[PDB]
Amino acid sequence: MAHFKEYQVIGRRLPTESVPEPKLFRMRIFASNEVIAKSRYWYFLQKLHKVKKASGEIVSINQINEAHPTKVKNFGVWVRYDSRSGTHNMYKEIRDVSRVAAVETLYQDMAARHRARFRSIHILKVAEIEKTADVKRQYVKQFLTKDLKFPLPHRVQKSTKTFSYKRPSTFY
Amino acid sequence: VEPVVVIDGKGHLVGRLASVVAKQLLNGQKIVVVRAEELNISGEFFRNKLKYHDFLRKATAFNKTRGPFHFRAPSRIFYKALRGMVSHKTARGKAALERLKVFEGIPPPYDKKKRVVVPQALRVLRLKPGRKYTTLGKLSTSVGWKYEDVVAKLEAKRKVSSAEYYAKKRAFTKKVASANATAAESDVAKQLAALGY
Amino acid sequence: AESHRLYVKGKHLSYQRSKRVNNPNVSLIKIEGVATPQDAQFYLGKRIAYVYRASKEVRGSKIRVMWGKVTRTHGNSGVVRATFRNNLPAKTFGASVRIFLYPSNI
Amino acid sequence: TDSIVKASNWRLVEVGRVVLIKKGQSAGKLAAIVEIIDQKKVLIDGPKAGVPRQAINLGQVVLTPLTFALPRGARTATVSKKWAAAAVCEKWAASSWAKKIAQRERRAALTDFERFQVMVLRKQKRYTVKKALAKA
Amino acid sequence: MKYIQTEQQIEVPEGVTVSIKSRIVKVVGPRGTLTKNLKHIDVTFTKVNNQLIKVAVHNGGRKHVAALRTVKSLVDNMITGVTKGYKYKMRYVYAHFPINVNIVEKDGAKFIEVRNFLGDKKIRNVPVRDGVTIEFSTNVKDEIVLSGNSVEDVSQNAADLQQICRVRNKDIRKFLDGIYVSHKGFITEDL
Amino acid sequence: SHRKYEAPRHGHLGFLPRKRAASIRARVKAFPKDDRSKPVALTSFLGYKAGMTTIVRDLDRPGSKFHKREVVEAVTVVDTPPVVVVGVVGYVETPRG
RNA sequence: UUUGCUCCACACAAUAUAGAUGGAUACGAAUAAGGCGUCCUUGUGGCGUCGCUGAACCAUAGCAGGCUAGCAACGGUGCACUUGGCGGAAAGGCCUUGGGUGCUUGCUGGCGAAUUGCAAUGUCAUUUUGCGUGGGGAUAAAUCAUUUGUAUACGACUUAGA
Missing domain, CATH: 3.10.20.10 (Ubiquitin-like (UB roll))
Known part of the structure; x- marks a missing residue:
């Protein structure tokens, strides 16, 4: 919202x-x-x-x-939302830095994955997971591995001019 | 900035380049687009070939010589895409379209001038890597443009001559950087470094 | 010196318009080198001259001027607004315009 | 005959990668990545350059080629300590990138008198350079 | 779901050297050399030692990491081709009409000639791709052998030789005539 | 409603064109393909139509009923005095033809 | 059809400007890769370095850029000749040789400027045409009328006629 x-x-x-x-x-x-x-x-x-x-x-x-x-936390969120032809309960997991910040990306996610607006969503319980291996979803388990590193390939630089004179470079 | 801007069309997307060149024409900048045979369109080749056939059937039923003219060359595909983005039926739009020269390949004079790119139209900066695209040359050849092979010959000839030019130019700037290396550590170079230059 | 310019180059873009109704009393000027409305805040109030030529000499010269000034910014991208003594004649959509800075509070 | 494989010497987002912030209130200061939230958000802390510890999107920073050794999730005093140990500000200033930032900042901060002296010294350097480029 | 980092591995045996500048792979070894243009795929190669090379995708969906194992499989196939070779044995099946298969040339063209297929007066001619050899295997009734470096070229010549004998608008559960691939293995035996 | 009775159309739309030509000398829009392993030879020739006459010749066409049998056939005679070369002309490949 | 036409140069009138006001400043290719330097075993090679925008690079001081004097180097640059070469995609441009003449802000001086009055674009570009001047240059065709019918409603076409 x-x-x-x-x-x-x-x-x-x-x-x-x-x-x-x-x-x-x-x-x-x-x-x-x-x-x-x-x-x-x-x-x-x-x-x-x-x-x-x-x-x-x-x-x-x-x-x-x-x-x-300023401490990164793994939040487990329980959602009750209404679809076009029924009402469902859901459990999504959100890794972020505050209960405020996890809810703001919960409504962005439910509006994107399931087309649920703010009027259709009853947030049941936002709780924080304290222990690793209590994380149930694999899109959060990706970031709990020991020594996480990854690159950001294909860097596109935003131009301040309408014409570039050399060529764009996409290195990083 | 420049009185006439020469744009290298290779690796560019048709609609984004046509949009920025349409606005640059209407604002008074003279634009020449070279290497139009190496434009891109997002989406696979069969999709844009189907789109060209859907355009290719629209014609006046009672006399097709007054119909929509289906120009096949990559320069004129690009020109139709641009002419749709300019109000071409007014004196201002006709005046703007006089400020445009589109070529496939790079002919004379514009093959000894500096070419630019437009990063809000480069396919390597706009499309996600892995999205399939269409090169305008193979599409135009597939819909009846007759001169891909001649453009290939003349562009290979231009590339050979320009490669020899750049070899000579790179040797010359090697001598220039060598002579500029002795100019440092003196008085005026350190004072220039004090003054940011 | 080979350079003598004491103004900033600019372009007469269009009148102030909606989608289907223009207003010839206000013109939009794209000043060269201005990309934000915060860079365009420097040029507010500077005097704008459109310089054109004729065939008939009037008062010794064959060059005529329409004088104006910069009023306010426009958009998010450094286009600026300008009012004139006599409005710009719309054949000059895309013509070059001299934006001076002789009242430069500098 | 060996098996040459060519590419991918990227900069990695990791704990200890230092970054240059390209937009925001900070906008040009250094920071260090201390935790990873997801693929696009990372927690940064810039306590020597005085940015607050904060979650940031990776489109607001640019990874510099400098790293140093941080534990995961280090608090601000320990980021200050490990920053002071590795002395990454002095490695940063030594690079040509920060030299270019300093160069264009000093170039923009020139008065008109300094600009005239720039022109005069450039003519005086050009004379000797073109003289040296006529015997070799 | 945009997995962070996936990778596969490619074993490089004692004979072959594989070379990858940008995304073009070259495998040289005791039976020759094979190249492949993998520039359509956006993967990351890394040599970790002369007997092991990893290949990785960073931030890929389902289809992209599906393509990574395809990349590993293609490079392993090129390696197995330049070490062991590839060899497909095909068999002629016919009910009544003997199929006569020979090798003709037309200005150095090297065609396979299929003749008398179900009593046709048509003479089918399948061109041989450059890099695959044909042996009409002695002491086996009705067999051809296609061997070479590339699975692509060998398996495609076997597919062309099978598809050129498609049955004469008939019931193909009854008219089972044709040339069908019996075996796909290697040129070097004991492996 | 529809035609009620199909018929092929009267005329050919690829010669729909029916106007007068540009001259009495009709243009050759396509000369034969070039094979540079051969000696130099002209690809066409200019002549004048004189008129027609009739030939009798034997047929060699095994499998026909008039095989090895005399047939009569109309022919055209064109008077071709030997053409004479007065110029040469060079044409370069462009991206416009 | 009262000395017509063309090219060049300067001499003056007109003519208009889709819009000069330091310079369009030439590799190609890739982008999950490259540019440059350097080295060898000249390679899909080793080592180093750079990007993170052209905010750059070159040019730029002087009566809209005057007149003189000197110091240092043998450079830079305009102009006009000239030597040779490359360029046919719409080449009509690029590179090079030699001398001449001019300027030099690379450095140091001497004199001038005002009053356009406290701003007025305060006139410096190229575009076409015309006219007399002066220096080369070269001396046609087409149409109607007549004629033929390979053509044809009429025009058109196709021929022929010193």
Whole structure:
């Protein structure tokens, strides 16, 4: 949807005489800003409890940062998405540097591989894999080998002019 | 920059080169395209031959001599691809198309001038390596252009003469670099290196 | 010296236009050596002269000038906008234009 | 008769490859590749040249032919230590590539008086060069 | 899924020397020399010792790494050709009509002449590719032998000799006449 | 609706062309192929049509009914006085013909 | 049909400009490879180096580039002759020999410039034509009318006629 932020939203139903201090549910929401995050909070909390935006109240809305934003992590993501003729559960694995960054390439991947837009995807659980050999997918196992090296063949240089005068070279 | 720009067409893709040359014509730059027989089109040879036959059947049903004219030579295939990208029915578009000279092979004068390339049209920089492509010379020969062998002879002759030219020129710049090597370590060379030159 | 140029070479591209309606009051000038609208910010306000020739001598000269100025940038690629005293006559689409810098805040 | 096989002496993206950043806020500083995220993203750290440790796309950097020895996933102080040990800034400045960057930077930073003196010294050098290219 | 680095290996035995500038392979050895233009394939060769050469693809899909093993197989075939040679034995099958197969020339052209195929008055002529020799094997009833350096040329002359005798608009489950490849092996025996 | 009855067309569209020629002397668009192992010889000749007459000759065509039998055949006679060479002309290969 | 025509040079009038304003600055091939240098065993060879854009390279100081004087080297360069060679793809251009004449900012001097008034493109290019001047050069055809019919509605065509 954008370059994501991760917000915890805490909300409850409004207090009545019979129930003061209600039970205070909490969700971790990936959204672009705090406006969309409080919409996605009531979108899922209406899918789990008898509440809505009118019978409830947003208690706190806080942005969560990656606790180590510069450590490369292997994230296991569980997705519930809607196809053209049904709904499915998926498990994809994403190697990136933050929970923010793994979700932003999750929506780019689900829109490319399966044509799933933001309205069709319920992210169930973004969890980080701590141990190697717990990585289940082979497109992430490629980068966990000891002493990873590879070249980037066929380097194409972007030109600042409309005419080059020598020839292009494609070495690296 | 240059008053007349000579573009080496070898290894270039037809539509990207035709687009940049169409804009350069309309902005006032005189362009001559040489070695048009070595253009490329993305996609395999059979695809672009089928495309040429689909073009080759479009003609006026009541008199085919007023129809779409199916020019077969690689220069005129390139020219049709370019003339589609210029508003050719106006005085500005006709004026722009007068600023264009397309040749297959490299004839006189333009075989002693510096040729350029256009990196937003080079097949080695635009296509993914492994995508199959078509050379315009074999396609044109397959659809009825008659002069591939003559262009081959004359281009081999030009390559021999230009190879001898470059051997002489490379010996001359060897002497020039040798004489420039003694000019260093003196006063004016170190002061030039102080001044970035 | 063999070089005497105190202006920057440029090209009269087109009028300000939409797809099907032009506006002859504003012209688009492609200045030679300008690739960004941040390089084009230097040339804003500099005076533009289109220099052309005639057969009839008018006031001693056979060369006539239409004077103008640079107003603002255009696009992402260094094309600039220019208004004139008399608008450029559209046969000059692609003609060379002198962009001076004699009010060069330099 | 031996079996000659010719090619592929590429530069490798690996832990310890140093890179020149060609776009961004840094844009011209050195950095070192410390981890590999995928085929296109690598984590770089430039603590001597003062870029932040960050994940970067490989279309924003260019691999230089310089390497040095890094452990996988090294933190910024250890990147600073191994950078200082191998002295890769002084190997970088010695190369002709950084000399060309310095050359065109000094060329662009010339005033008009320096440009006139450039012209005069170039004429004075050209005279002696063409004199030397008439006896050999 | 764009595998990071795959590679295969090519064994180079004691006789042959293989040479690869850009992507053109030359294998020289005791039965001659064979060249191949592999420039259509974008693979990376690397000599690690005079008895072992690796060939690799970096960042290839499924079809590209499918082509890598084809590259290894073609170079191994050239090596096996210049060491051991290649030899295809073909047999003549006929129900009634004896096939007469000889060798004719027309200004140094070296044609195989197939005659009397199912009683035809047509005389079929298959040209021999340069680099494959024919022996009409004695002490075997109805056999030809095609031997040479290249699997391509040898197997293609065997395929041309088989396809020139295609059955006379008949039921080819009954009219089983023709020249069919019986054996593909090497020129050098004991291997 | 369709033709209801097929017939071959009247005329040949590759000679659709029916106009007057450019001159009385018709152009040779193609001379025979060059084989440079031979002596020098002209490829054509100029003559004038005089008219026709009739020949009787024997047929040699084994397998025919008029084999070894006299047939009559119309012929054309062209008067060819010996042509005389006044010039030579050189033509170079171009990429335009 | 009142000295016509052509080439050259300069002499002046006109004519217009699809757009001069230092220089279009010549290998080929590959791009999962090459360029250059160097060496040998001249190769699909060894060693070194370079790329990461032409932001380069050459040229560029002087009354729109004046007038003089000298120092150092024997260079660079314009012009006009000349020696020979190469180039037919649309060659009509490139290379070379010899002397002459001019300039030299490679270095050091002397004088001049103003007032276009605080900017006005502040006029420096090539394109065609015309006219008298002066120096070579060479002295035709076609059409109608007549005629033939290998042609033909008419034109056209095909012939013939000192």
